[PDB]
Each structure stands twice: as structure tokens, then as C-alpha cells.
Design brief:
1 chain of a larger assembly; about 1100 residues; alpha/beta; TIM Barrel; Nucleotidyltransferase, domain 5; 5 domains; five-stranded mixed beta sheet; binds ligand A1I9T; binds magnesium ion; binds zinc ion; DNA-binding; DNA-directed DNA polymerase
DNA sequence: GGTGCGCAT
DNA sequence: CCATGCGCACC
């Protein structure tokens, strides 16, 4: 089979009828237990392909019940709508019995019963020890003791009726008193002896209640902290202590049960599997609430649902017994039919899987043979008919086909001893057809098998109505007076900048933008962005932007963005005079020559970059505005908390991401598996096995800057469950359970990202007092750096770079530096072009490097950004509608993918208007192109930083190292230029195959070399001068911070800062600061502690 | 802490 | 031969 590389499922080398459901059309099964790759490291198939398989097989419905989550619900909805298959939305929850009594039957005979296994039904007592606080006896099973028993219990090969009578004549006490009491009572009933229901105590539960701080409550562990005979004396020696603690720290038997299931009880309980299915939409909301609470309130190494919570919310939730790890199967195989018929009273349907699923039980000795397994399954079918419950065969599907099992194994093997499944062999939990299931349950008879496989499953499916896990429309928050507020802000700023009578250009722009925004109900997005940016500016932080927000003039006037999308123009700061150039004569208003106001003597401010708003709001303005804001890294938490304030702590959630097994991790898993199992896989197989195990959920994290806001007239459970990122209960924010991609079309996702540029600019403003917004972004001298390194005062030979853009965001990279060297930009428009080429896909390597090198087009003419295509075509003479459509087709790399007719219309229109041939050839090769407003914002930040680099070199270098540089040698740096150059040469001679740490070191070293070439120098740390994290400026020298010293750590860094304000001996330092000898050794050889006179 | 590695704009 | 940045897993 071609999987990329061809495979026969036996091995893979480097160069068919599918499974069918043979049952009749109306007699198809419904699979009610399906695990997708969203079950963390358990299942390997996407819910989409399972739903597609069910659709092909003719199944009317299928259930998606993952282990503790609903993260496959949106994909399942899409797949069920594509395949015409009804989806039942469920979960495989770990339920913990809320109240497990300590005393059962409301002088102590602490007893114990070594036995022949764990199933009171299917094995029996071999020893019956007890101490009245002594009665010890051996019982002989007819069968010879298995080597397991001979070892677990130190017993090698009177009648019970007699030993049982002796013990009956002799307050019962036991560790795991349920297990011993069940064994004793079954033995009693075996001879018609009275049940002997005297008061009982389970020392396990008493220890759990009295010492919750403990982690494991087994007898050995507990015995340490504080044969049947030994077991008994041990329990007795404890039980005395436990009862004394119960009487003192908290006096009767009954009172031993008063405080049960209260507190962290969920944390110590042992969970069991239950299946929860939503019966209707309200059931789905209740299921989301249950998942959210199991993730947020009752999480202990897994999401847990206390049984009391599942009881409250079960009017719309079908509860099923799940698998052999469910409590009904556990009771029937280990406690008896009466305990299973009492537990089954709580379920709504009973699940029985094929004997192939249960094989690991027979391998683990839990079930002795296939006969016992058949008996257990048959009893469960009968118990269900007796209590009038639906009995269904489920299958416990974990992957699609029988050949996919290996993938699961590999994943499981990757967990080592963490996964209990690694002890035994995995079952056959592929997706079985109706005929396969009928065959697997033929030992119950054809009628019963056909009932529990086909009829009952379809009855369960019919019980549930159609459910929609994902909404259809967008629900934005409501802020009263938002449209009016946005209009007022925009017009007030426009009047202040361009006088009360606004230029007709500005009038038209504002009117169209505001009609698109307020008309579509998008004003709340603008208002939230405005508030966030306004609060950021008050705190003294500039907010940059990513994407196309800068294309909006309402975004400029409301203060959200610094990019002015108007046509190039002058305006007078004093008298409000303005003059626009809509003729395409200038790329930007920044490139316009200096001019003085005709009306008065003040100079004219030049602005405008000719960015249409259609790129942001789409043609017709119906598109949802998307405003990604690069707030400072320091201020990002403040912006998140401000969203919390704006909308309330219960309606804002950090957007959640699901991290899966990618190629690197999957390859590592396969390699570890083949090492442990000592095989030799062929590279192609290994690659097939890695592919099969890829995409499986591995963890959950948070989105970098995404806050999801829920309308205050709804609740989060109408959209998604919630959780803590990575299941960290100490997290300050809750994330959405669903991946944000499935919900961001229905609720607002505020991208409040963090960028180092606003941090660097804030530091530069602090170090110089210059206001960041007063910096000239049209300065000619600052563009000389983009040309060559001479403006800096150094040569190409000394800074190893042709361009002086080292350390300039988005322009200091070797690729971009090479492009700058080959193009020599000299204007803001050309800088925006350089950006659209350094970042686009297929825009420079084979489309424009050549056109520029051969003179076909200049840098200013080639296609750099997506807005440029529309601007050029509209200037060429095409209709705005034609250019918009063509600009979209090109930016999406669909020039070739569009039909012949469309390509034809576009080509005809362009050629009819004198659009060159090289321009259409370029369009043909472009895969992705990014917006003009994005480039304008990033170029404005880069120019603001470069201004300081050129005119305030010491301040710029201090800010860069303090904010952007994290890994410093500091030894070559402190030595001088020669050592820095030697380190750079070492990293360079390490070649293309160099570590990420080495590349970061090379970047910092390049910056340090450039700073040294210019006359500034770095200095070793000073205990009474260096800062914790920031470089200090002293003269023309940069004093390195403590964090710069290799491994000085950051917490201990602040420590030495805290200590130095309190007040010798060189030992005092290590003592207070918590300096590790090793780092003191560093500060000593490098001269730092030399000062110390000790 | 440090280092991958996955994810996102 | 895209840049930058965040967050969790694992050592
Ligand atoms: O891949 C990306 N790289 C960058 N780089 C940042 C950048 C910085 C500066 C400029 Cl001027 C530009 Cl255009 C881009 N931003 C991005 N924002 C979104 N993306 C991903 C684009 N994806 C992938 C392709 O399909 C569209 C969605 C990216
Ligand atoms: Mg015992
Ligand atoms: Mg966004
Ligand atoms: Zn599972
Ligand atoms: Zn299960
Ligand atoms: Zn299962
Ligand atoms: Zn004027």
C-alpha cells in the first residue's frame, strides 16, 4: 500500500476490497464506544476517518466517547455531516464513588484471608487469620496452588465448613475490608451459614480519611509509615492506632461514617470507567459542565467526576458501564451477581464487549479461562434484562483496522512504567463490523446476540436526538454605546488632525469604514482593541500590530494602530492644512520631500501608505475585523487581566491548544520501541510507524496571546468545556477545552500577543526620555544603515555585514541582509517591499530576485505585499472589484488552481490595461503574500529602533542586550573585539550543522562585535552596580547583569540584588545570595569577587 | 534551568 | 533561501 514508500503491513520498502459490513441494510449495529486520537496517547485514528468508515459500512449512528474529554466533538460533527451518520456525543469519564463508608454494619477481631486470587466468585480462601484485640487456620483448595499464589502468599500445597464455623464463633476489622468481607461472606453462603453482619471496619478507608496527606494507603506502605497471620497482626497493630486517632482527633461505630465523601475524598478514591452520552442539547451542556468540573475541581492525575455530581446532572445523560474497568464488570468478576445487580441499578445501559477485548484479563489471571469470561458476560446480559436495562455490545474501539494496533502499542510503550497497559498485552480494539460483532457474541445465542448488537444499540441511538456541539453564528460581547463611541472617537481624532471640515478623501474613507463596521455589528471588536491599546499607552507601552488592522483608518483614528492607510499626504500640526497625493506618485507619505505649510510657517507632517481597507474588511466590508496586537512582553499579563476586568472573570478564558505527537516525537517513540523490543526496522517502515502514531493528542497548552471572550448573556458551556492548561491546577487562567479553531468563528479571540519590540522601545524611552512617537521615521540618515554600514562608523570587514541593520528587528537576519545588499532600499515604500519579499512565499527566490537583477522591474515595482497588487491594478485602470478578486487569487496562490475561464478573464483585463507581461508572470509564481499594513507596522518599529541605533548607539545596545539577548559568553565580550571575533569564527566553522543555542550565541556575538567596533565595550558584573536583568550604562561601557554570568540563575540573581541593599568575606555572598560555589568560582576567576578583600 | 519540540501570528 | 515568540515535556 502506498503510504507516501509502500507497505504490506509486514514491512515497508521504497520503490483492494475494503472491509465491508455484510449485515442487511436495516440490521446494522451502532458503535457506542469509540476512542479517537483525542484520547491522550491511547487511540490513533481521527474521529473523521472512524465516522467515514461507519458511514461507508451503513451504520446509522456512531458515538465519540474519548477518555475524559470532548475535544473531538467539532471534528466529529463535521465528519458526521459529511458522511450522513448521526453522532452521539459522549465521554469515557473516570468516576469516583463520592461516599465510600468506613463502617459497614452501622472487641475487635482484626482478620485477614490469604486466598487464590482476587475474584471472590471464581476463587476461594486458603488461609483465615484473625486476632481478637488468635485464630489462624489453613484451608486447602482442591487444586494445587499456582506458583503466583505460592509466591504472593508464602503458602505451598480442616474443611472450610469447619474453619468458617470456628471463625464465626471466634467488630470485624480488615484492610480493604470490602475484599475480605466479600470473601468471608461468599464462603459463608457456600455452606448456608449466616452472613454474620456484625459491625465492620475497613482500615483502608479509615487511613484515607484520617491521613489524607498520605499518597499510597496499601498495608505495607502504611505499616512502614506507622501470609494471612502476619497481615492480620499488622492490620491489628495499625487498627488500634487508627481507632485511637478517630476517637481523639475527631467514639462509636456509627460516627465513623458521619464525615464521608467530604473534601479531597475524590483525590484518594480509585476511579472507574463510566460512559456518559448526551441525550439532547441540554444534555450536551450538562456534559460540558461535567467535563469542566472534572478538569477544574476534581482533577487528580486524571479528570474525575464524583458520582454525586453525575447523579445531579443525569436527566439528559445516558450512563453506561463502559469496559472491564467499569464497576459493573469489576463487581461481576470479583464480587458476585448480587453486587453487580445493585451497582447496575445506577446505569441506563450495560456494555458488553467481545472476549477479544477482555483477553488481557485472562492473561493477568483476573479471569481464569474463557469459560469464566463467557459466564461473566452472560451474567451481565441477564442482570440487565432483570433490571429492564438496555444491554449493548460496544467494542471499545481504539483504532480503525486490525493492522493499526501496532501504532497504539508504540505509543503505549513510549510511556514505560507509567502506563499499566505495558504490563500485559493490548486487546483487539479495532472497529468491528456488524457481522464480526455478531460472531463475537454467538455464544449467547443468535437471538440474544442480534438483540444486544443491533436492536439495543439502535434503540440507544434513537433515544438521542440530533445534537450540535458547535454554534453557527458569531456571538460577540455587547458594550452599550459602542458604535457611537467608535464613530465619535474616529471623527474627533480626524477633526483634530484635519480640521473640522474634513477633506473629502477622509470623509469618504471614514464613512465607508464606519458603515462597514457599525453596519455589521463589529464595533465591539474595535472598542475592545481601543481600550486595550489605550490602557497600554497609559502605562507607557506602544502596541504594534500584526495582520491588516493598519489598513483601517478608523483603527488609526481610534488609536488602535500607528499605520496610516490614507494616500500619501501632508498635514499641518498647527493649522490643520492638508494635501493628498492620490495619483500614485509616492509610495508613502514618508518618501515625500520636506515641505512647509502654505497657510502658516509650520512644517508639514507627511503620512499615508496607500493601504486599502478592503484588505482588512474584505470587499463590501462584511469581513470580521481581526486585530492582533503585539503588546510588550512585560505588559501582556496586564492586558489579559484587563480583559478579565472588561468582561468578568467568568467570561474570559485563555485560548487552548492541543499539542499532538509530531514527526520528531513519533520518530523517537518508534526508535525507543525498536530498542526496547530489540528489532531492526527498515527506514521506510520506521517512517510508516512514525506516520501512524502521529497526530495523537499528547498534551494541552495555551495559545500565546489568545483570550476567548464569551458574551455575558451566555455561558462558556454553550460553546466549550474549560480546563487548566497542561492540567496545571495552579494556573491563574482557565483555557477552553476545545481547540480555538473550532470556536473562534463563534466567539471573539483577542490576540493579545507579546513582542520584544515594544519592550525595547520602552527601555529606550526610559534611558533617553525621548517619547517613542516623536521619533522621525522618515529620517534620511537612519536609511543609510539599510544601505551600508558607514553611517554606523564601521566597515563591512569589521562588522561581517554589508548592511548596518544588525539587531534591527526583521532586518538583521542574513537572508534579509542579503536581500538588502542586492536591492539597496532607500525609501519607506522599498522597506515595505523588502519585507513583503523576505517573508512571502515564492515572491523573491524565483519571482523577483531575477526580475530585479535583470532590470525588468525595480524593487519598488515588484509584487511585495498583497495590497500592492490591488493598488497597482486600480492605478492600471482595472475595476476595484476585478483587482480585489485577482489580488486574492494571487495571494492564495490560486493563479494556477482557478479554472481556465477565470484565469482568462483576469488576464484579458490586465493586458487590456497595459499591465506588463513580467507582472503577470510574477503573479503566476506566488504562493503566499502577506498584507501591507503588517509590513508598515513592523517597519515603523524597526525604524524607531534604528533611530536609536544610529544616534544613541550606547542606549540602543544596552536596550538590545537587556531585552533581546539572553545567552552571553561575556568572557570574549569582556575581553574585547578579538575574543568576540574568535568565538564568532568558532560558531561559523561549526557550519550549517550548529545548535540553536550556538546560533543565538552567534547573533548576540555579532551584535557585541558591532558594538565593540564602534568604541563601546562591555564590563564584568559588579556586585554593587550590576542589575538583576538589565545591562547598566556607565560612560561608554555596558555593565553586564548577573543573569549574563553562565548559570547565575534569575531568582538567585534578584537575591544578590536583595542582599546588596542589606549590606564581606566572600563567603557571606554565597551564604545570603544562595550563590552556588561553582558560580562563585566564576565571579572569582573573572575578577568579580576580586574586590572582596577577604 | 536548559533544551527540544509543537504551535501560532 | 521567513521571523519571532510562547508554552509544555523531558532531562
Ligand atoms: O508564517 C508566518 N510568518 C510570519 N512572520 C512575521 C512577519 C513579520 C514582518 C512582516 Cl513585514 C511580515 Cl509580512 C511577517 N507571520 C505570520 N502570520 C501568520 N502566519 C502563518 C500564515 N499561515 C500559513 C499560510 O496560510 C495562511 C496562514 C505567519
Ligand atoms: Mg488482607
Ligand atoms: Mg486574531
Ligand atoms: Zn482508552
Ligand atoms: Zn474504558
Ligand atoms: Zn474505552
Ligand atoms: Zn499650517
Amino acid at each position: 500500500y502506498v503510504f507516501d514508500k509502500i507497505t504490506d503491513y509486514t514491512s515497508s520498502f521504497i520503490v483492494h476490497t475494503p472491509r465491508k459490513d455484510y449485515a442487511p441494510e436495516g440490521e446494522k449495529r451502532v458503535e457506542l464506544h469509540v476512542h479517537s486520537n483525542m484520547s491522550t496517547m491511547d487511540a490513533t485514528n481521527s474521529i473523521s476517518d472512524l465516522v467515514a468508515q461507519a458511514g461507508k459500512w451503513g451504520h446509522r449512528a456512531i458515538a465519540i466517547t474519548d477518555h475524559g474529554g470532548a475535544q473531538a466533538f467539532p471534528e466529529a460533527h463535521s465528519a458526521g455531516k459529511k458522511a450522513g451518520v448521526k453522532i452521539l456525543y459522549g465521554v469515557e469519564a473516570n468516576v469516583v464513588d463520592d461516599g465510600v463508608p468506613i463502617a459497614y454494619n452501622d472487641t475487635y477481631v482484626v482478620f485477614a484471608v490469604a486466598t487464590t486470587g482476587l475474584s471472590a466468585v471464581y476463587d476461594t480462601i486458603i488461609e483465615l487469620a484473625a486476632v481478637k484485640m488468635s485464630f489462624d487456620e489453613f484451608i486447602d483448595p482442591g487444586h494445587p496452588l499456582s506458583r503466583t499464589t505460592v509466591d504472593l502468599t508464602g503458602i505451598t500445597d480442616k474443611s472450610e465448613e469447619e474453619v468458617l464455623r470456628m471463625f464465626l464463633e471466634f467488630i470485624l476489622v480488615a484492610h480493604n475490608a470490602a475484599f475480605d468481607m466479600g470473601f468471608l461472606n461468599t464462603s459463608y453462603a457456600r455452606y448456608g451459614i449466616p452472613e454474620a453482619a456484625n459491625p465492620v471496619i475497613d482500615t483502608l478507608e479509615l487511613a484515607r480519611y484520617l491521613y489524607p496527606q498520605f499518597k499510597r494507603f496499601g498495608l505495607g506502605v502504611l505499616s512502614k509509615k506507622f501470609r494471612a497471620i502476619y497481615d492480620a497482626e499488622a492490620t491489628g497493630h495499625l487498627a488500634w492506632i487508627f481507632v485511637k486517632e478517630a476517637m481523639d482527633n475527631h467514639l462509636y461505630h456509627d460516627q465513623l461514617n458521619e464525615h464521608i465523601g467530604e473534601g479531597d475524598s475524590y483525590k484518594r478514591a480509585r476511579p472507574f470507567h463510566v460512559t456518559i452520552l448526551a441525550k439532547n442539547q441540554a444534555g450536551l451542556k450538562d456534559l460540558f459542565k461535567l467535563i469542566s468540573m472534572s478538569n477544574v475541581e476534581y482533577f487528580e492525575r486524571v479528570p474525575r467526576i464524583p458520582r454525586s455530581q453525575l447523579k445531579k446532572m443525569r436527566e439528559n445523560l445516558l450512563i453506561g458501564s463502559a469496559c472491564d474497568k467499569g464497576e459493573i464488570f469489576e463487581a461481576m468478576m470479583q464480587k458476585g451477581v448480587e453486587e453487580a445487580r445493585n451497582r447496575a441499578k445506577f446505569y441506563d445501559y450495560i456494555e458488553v464487549m467481545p472476549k477479544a477485548v477482555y483477553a488481557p484479563l485472562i492473561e493477568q489471571e483476573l479471569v481464569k479461562n474463557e469459560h469464566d469470561l463467557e459466564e461473566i458476560i452472560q451474567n451481565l446480559v441477564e442482570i440487565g434484562k432483570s433490571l429492564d436495562k438496555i444491554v449493548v455490545a460496544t467494542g471499545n474501539v481504539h483504532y480503525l483496522n486490525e493492522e493499526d494496533a501496532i501504532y497504539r502499542k508504540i505509543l503505549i510503550n513510549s510511556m514505560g512504567g507509567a502506563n499499566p497497559l505495558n504490563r500485559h498485552s493490548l486487546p483487539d480494539v479495532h472497529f468491528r463490523t456488524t457481522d464480526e460483532m455478531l460472531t463475537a457474541f454467538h455464544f449467547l445465542g443468535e437471538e440474544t446476540a442480534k438483540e444486544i448488537v443491533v436492536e439495543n444499540t439502535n434503540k440507544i441511538a434513537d433515544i438521542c436526538e440530533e445534537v450540535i456541539p458547535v454554534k453557527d453564528e458569531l456571538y460577540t460581547p455587547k458594550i452599550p454605546g459602542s458604535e457611537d463611541e467608535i464613530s465619535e472617537l474616529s471623527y474627533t481624532k480626524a477633526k483634530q488632525m484635519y480640521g473640522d471640515p474634513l477633506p473629502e478623501i477622509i470623509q469618504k474613507r471614514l464613512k465607508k469604514e464606519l458603515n462597514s463596521i457599525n453596519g455589521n455589528g463589529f464595533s465591539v471588536i474595535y472598542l475592545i482593541a481601543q481600550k486595550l491599546v489605550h490602557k497600554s499607552n497609559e502605562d507607557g507601552y506602544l502596541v504594534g500590530s500584526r495582520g491588516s488592522v493598519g489598513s483601517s483608518f478608523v483603527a488609526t483614528m481610534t488609536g488602535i494602530t500607528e499605520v496610516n492607510p490614507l494616500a500619501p499626504h501632508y498635514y499641518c500640526p498647527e493649522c490643520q492644512y492638508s494635501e493628498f497625493f492620490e495619483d500614485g506618485t509616492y509610495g508613502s507619505g514618508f518618501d515625500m520631500p520636506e515641505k512647509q505649510c502654505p497657510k502658516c510657517g509650520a512644517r508639514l507632517n507627511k503620512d499615508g501608505h496607500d493601504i486599502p481597507f478592503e484588505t482588512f474588511l474584505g470587499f463590501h466590508g462584511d469581513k470580521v475585523p481581526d486585530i492582533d496586537l503585539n503588546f510588550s512582553g512585560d505588559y501582556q499579563a496586564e492586558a489579559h487581566n484587563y480583559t478579565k476586568v472588561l468582561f468578568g472573570e467568568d467570561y474570559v478564558y485563555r485560548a487552548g491548544t492541543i499539542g499532538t505527537v509530531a514527526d520528531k516525537t513519533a520518530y523517537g517513540y518508534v526508535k525507543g520501541y525498536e530498542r526496547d523490543n530489540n528489532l531492526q526496522f527498515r527506514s521506510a517502515e520506521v517512517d510508516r510507524l512514525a506516520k501512524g502514531a502521529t497526530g495523537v493528542k499528547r498534551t494541552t497548552g495555551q495559545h500565546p496571546g489568545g483570550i476567548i471572550v464569551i458574551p455575558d448573556y451566555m455561558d462558556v458551556y454553550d460553546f466549550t468545556p474549560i480546563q487548566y492548561p497542561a492540567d496545571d491546577q495552579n494556573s491563574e487562567w482557565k483555557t477552553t477545552h476545545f481547540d480555538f479553531h473550532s470556536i473562534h468563528d463563534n466567539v471573539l479571540k483577542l490576540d493579545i500577543l507579546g513582542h520584544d519590540d515594544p519592550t525595547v522601545i520602552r527601555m529606550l524611552q526610559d534611558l533617553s526620555g525621548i517619547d517613542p512617537q516623536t521619533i522621525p521615521t522618515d529620517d534620511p540618515e537612519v536609511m543609510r544603515i539599510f544601505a551600508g554600514p558607514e553611517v554606523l562608523g564601521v566597515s563591512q570587514e569589521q562588522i561581517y555585514s554589508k548592511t548596518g541593520t544588525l539587531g534591527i528587528p526583521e532586518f538583521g537576519t542574513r537572508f534579509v541582509r542579503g536581500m538588502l545588499e542586492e536591492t539597496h532600499p532607500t525609501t519607506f515604500a522599498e522597506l515595505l517591499q523588502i519585507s513583503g519579499l523576505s517573508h512571502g512565499t515564492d515572491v523573491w527566490l524565483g519571482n523577483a530576485e531575477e526580475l530585479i537583477r535583470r532590470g525588468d522591474a525595480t524593487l519598488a515595482e515588484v509584487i511585495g505585499c498583497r495590497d500592492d497588487i490591488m493598488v497597482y491594478l486600480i492605478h492600471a485602470g482595472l475595476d476595484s472589484g476585478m483587482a480585489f478578486k485577482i489580488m486574492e487569487t494571487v495571494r492564495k496562490g490560486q493563479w494556477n488552481k482557478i479554472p481556465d475561464e477565470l484565469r482568462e478573464t483576469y488576464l484579458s483585463a490586465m493586458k487590456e490595461n497595459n499591465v506588463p507581461d513580467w507582472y503577470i508572470d510574477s503573479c503566476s509564481k506566488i504562493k503566499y503574500m502577506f498584507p501591507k499594513a503588517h509590513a508598515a507596522a513592523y517597519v515603523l518599529m524597526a525604524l524607531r529602533v534604528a533611530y536609536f541605533k544610529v544616534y544613541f548607539p550606547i542606549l540602543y545596545y544596552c536596550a538590545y542586550f537587556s531585552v533581546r539577548a539572553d545567552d552571553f559568553d561575556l568572557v570574549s565580550m569582556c575581553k574585547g573585539k578579538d575574543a568576540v571575533k574568535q568565538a564568532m569564527k568558532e560558531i561559523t566553522d561549526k557550519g550549517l550543522d550548529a545548535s540553536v543555542k550556538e546560533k543565538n550565541q552567534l547573533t548576540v556575538l555579532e551584535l557585541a562585535n558591532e558594538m565593540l567596533e564602534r568604541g563601546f565595550k562591555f564590563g564584568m558584573i559588579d556586585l554593587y552596580k550590576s542589575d538583576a536583568v538589565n545591562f547598566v550604562i556607565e560612560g561608554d561601557t555596558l555593565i553586564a547583569p548577573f543573569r549574563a554570568v553562565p548559570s547565575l540563575g534569575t531568582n538567585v540573581a534578584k537575591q544578590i540584588v536583595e542582599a546588596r541593599k542589606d549590606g564581606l568575606s566572600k563567603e557571606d555572598l554565597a551564604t545570603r545570595g544562595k550563590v552556588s560555589k561553582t558560580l562563585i568560582e566564576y565571579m572569582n576567576d573573572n575578577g568579580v569577587l576580586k574586590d572582596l578583600p577577604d
